[PDB]
């Protein structure tokens with residue numbers, strides 16, 4: 818079993834930056850890949866970024882050049898550095914983790930990101 822706990826969301830102005838964290842607990846040494854997704858109300862989840870144990874990253878077209886996914890194996894934590902946020906980035910962001918030979922998946926509880934000038 819693998820549990821994921823997210824943090825870092827909140828309010829940010831357009832053009833601002835946030836960093837999200839996804840901390841893994843349990844049998845973290847069997848995690849193969851971890852990814853970031855987001856979901857806005859009434860829409861399917863959108864894939865954002867993926868990273869392997871080796872550090873190979875893959876991004877969706879909508880966040881390339883702005884979002885950076887990284888991982889700290891010692892802390893069992895995957896980060897999503899989000900620069901130059903736009904109102905269209907408002908969503909609940911979820912991290913996932915593939916483990917047990919890429920056969921099992923766990924999801925975080927999600928964290929709300931709202932990009933607004935108020």
Ligand SMILES: CCOP(=S)(OCC)Oc1ncn(-c2ccccc2)n1
Nearest residue numbers: 841845846850851869870888893894
């Ligand atoms: C959500 C946290 O994800 P990460 S940093 O995994 C990113 C792919 O979890 C994690 N923790 C320890 N891991 C590990 C250690 C030794 C060998 C293989 C894996 N992997």
Ligand code: NA
Nearest residue numbers: 825836837838
């Ligand atoms: Na953080």
